[PDB]
């Protein structure tokens, strides 16, 4: 289905995988909506006229004062009063269908592959945890930093070296998600990461 470039000591190899031919923008949108919604803290809060600090006393008689009728000064019509239908602590998470997010995952990777922005690699040469080392490797890999990159690998040393770069987002393959894919211009993966990915969308 797709032909995906693989970087090797032996050169620019090639790999083929059956990623979805059809990309569904709306679905991709629904996955990101869900991802961004469930991470909400929902910590907005207000006080109701029952929760505000004032007494429940009727501030003046119902009739014959020549003023507007009132109960307690906690009523929302008062400055300093309760608020009507203000926010309360709220859980914005919801369970997006598994097949939808798995499908979304496959489609997001497919979009990058269709653009020629998906690159797999066997190893990361000499990067042992230093940013300068990842930079050197990135240059040879064709990653000059003019494009944002989602780097997916199980190698902690690699993730540590690249993580502080402004143009790099780092992920372990168990964490591959479509928001992070769609955020970034390029997708870079371990053969190992490519494998757990293919297991996930299978």
């Amino acid at each position: 289905v797709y032909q995906i470039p693989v970087l090797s000591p032996s050169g620019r190899r090639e790999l083929a995988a059956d990623l979805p031919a059809e990309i569904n923008p709306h679905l991709l949108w629904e996955v990101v909506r869900w991802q961004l919604a469930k991470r909400r803290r929902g910590t907005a809060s207000t006080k109701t006229r029952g929760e505000v600090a004032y007494s429940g006393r009727k501030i003046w008689p119902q009739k014959h004062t020549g003023r507007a009728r009132h109960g307690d000064i906690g009523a929302p019509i008062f400055v300093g009063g309760g608020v009507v239908f203000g926010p309360k602590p709220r859980d914005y998470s919801y369970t997006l269908p598994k097949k939808v997010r798995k499908k979304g995952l496959a489609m997001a990777v497919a979009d990058r592959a269709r653009e020629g922005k998906l690159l797999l690699v066997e190893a990361f040469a000499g990067v042992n945890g230093k940013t300068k080392e990842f930079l050197a490797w990135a240059k040879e890999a064709g990653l000059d930093g003019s494009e944002s990159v989602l780097l997916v690998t199980g190698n902690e040393l690699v993730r540590r070296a690249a993580r502080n770069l402004p143009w790099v987002v780092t992920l372990a393959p168990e964490g591959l998600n479509v928001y992070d894919i769609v955020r970034t211009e390029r997708l870079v993966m371990d053969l190992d990461a490519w494998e757990v990915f293919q297991n996930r969308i299978g």
């Binding site: 923008p25 979009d111 653009e115 769609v182």
Partner: peptide
């Protein structure tokens, strides 16, 4: 395909 392209279908929202 980027974030500024992610969009619901007409009528979805």
């Amino acid at each position: 395909m980027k974030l500024s392209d992610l969009r619901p279908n007409p009528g979805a929202n």
